[PDB]
Amino acid sequence: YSNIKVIDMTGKQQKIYSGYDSFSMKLIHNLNLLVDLTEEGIRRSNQQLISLKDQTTALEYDLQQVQKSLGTEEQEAQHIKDVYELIDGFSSNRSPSMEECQELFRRLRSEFPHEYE
């Protein structure tokens, strides 16, 4: 730990230290210009991300059209009628006379033919 060779090539001339302890105990304006230069890339990255956000609207907007408006709302509208049709089929029945039977089966067979069969 205390006696493992450290070779220093970080500077223009070479140095040698006995170990990490001897090593461990051996402008900003310009740096900030480098920071300024980096921020140009940040908006470049975000604009490209905004292009992905733009495609994200395409995903979202097609989900509105295909998934919600077409696929869901159409099957909604069809079967919600079928519920009320089948409830209406249930309503028709009870204690008829001769002509009441005729009007029942006229009504059942004409209006609800699939359910009737």
Partner 1 sequence: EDILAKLKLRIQERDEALNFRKEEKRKLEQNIEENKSMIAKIEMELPNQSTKYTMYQELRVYSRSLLE
Partner 2 sequence: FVSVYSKDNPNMLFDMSGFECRILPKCRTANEEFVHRDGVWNLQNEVTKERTAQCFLKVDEESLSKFHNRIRQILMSSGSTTFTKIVNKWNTALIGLMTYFREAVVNTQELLDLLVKCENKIQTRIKIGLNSKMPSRFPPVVFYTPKEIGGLGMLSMGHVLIPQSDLRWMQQTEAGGVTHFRSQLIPNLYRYIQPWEAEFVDSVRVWAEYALKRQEANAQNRRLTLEDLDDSWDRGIPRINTLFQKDRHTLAYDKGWRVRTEFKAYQILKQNPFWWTHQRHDGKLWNLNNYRTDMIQALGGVEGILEHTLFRGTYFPTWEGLFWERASGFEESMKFKKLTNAQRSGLNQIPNRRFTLWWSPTINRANVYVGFQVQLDLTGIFMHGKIPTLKISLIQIFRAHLWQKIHESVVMDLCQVFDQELDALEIQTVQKETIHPRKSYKMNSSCADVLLFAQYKWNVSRPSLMADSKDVMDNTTTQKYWLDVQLRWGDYDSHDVERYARAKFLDYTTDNMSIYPSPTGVLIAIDLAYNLYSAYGNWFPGMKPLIRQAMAKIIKANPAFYVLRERIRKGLQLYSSENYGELFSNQIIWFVDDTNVYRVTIHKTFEGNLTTKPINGAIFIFNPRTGQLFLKIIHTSVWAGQKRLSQLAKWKTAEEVAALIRSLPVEEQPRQIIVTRKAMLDPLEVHLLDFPNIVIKGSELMLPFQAIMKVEKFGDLILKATEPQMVLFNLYDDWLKTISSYTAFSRVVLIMRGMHINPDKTKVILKPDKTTITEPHHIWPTLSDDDWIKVELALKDMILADYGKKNNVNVASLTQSEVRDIILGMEISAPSQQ
Q: Which residues bind partner 1 (CB under 8 A)?
A: 29-30, 32-33, 36-37, 39-40, 42-43, 46-47, 50, 53, 56-57, 60, 63-64, 67-68, 72-73, 75-76, 79-80, 82-83, 86-87, 89-90, 93
Q: According to the binding rule CB under 8 A, does residue 9 interact with partner 2?
A: yes
Task: Look at residue 1 and give the partner it binds from partner 1, partner 2, none, a contact being a CB closer than 5 to 8 Å depending on partner kind.
Answer: partner 2
- How far is the C-alpha of 1 from the C-alpha of 22, rounded, in Å? 11
Residue 92 near which of partner 1, partner 2, none (CB within 5-8 Å, type-dependent): none
Residue 33 in the binding site for partner 2 (CB under 8 A): yes
Question: Is residue 41 a contact residue for partner 2 (CB under 8 A)?
Answer: yes
3-state SS, residue 8: strand
Cβ contacts of residue 74 below 8 Å, gap of 6+?
none
d(CA 110, CA 45): 66
By C-beta, is 22 or 102 nearer to partner 2?
A: 22
Rounded Cα gap, residues 111 and 78, in angstroms: 16
Distance CA 12, CA 17 (A): 16
Which residues are within 8 A (CB) of 2 and not within 5 positions of it... i.e. 6 or more apart? Answer: 18, 19, 20, 21
Residues at the contact surface with partner 2, assessed by CB under 8 A? 1, 4-10, 12-13, 20-21, 23-24, 33-35, 37-38, 41-42, 45, 48, 51
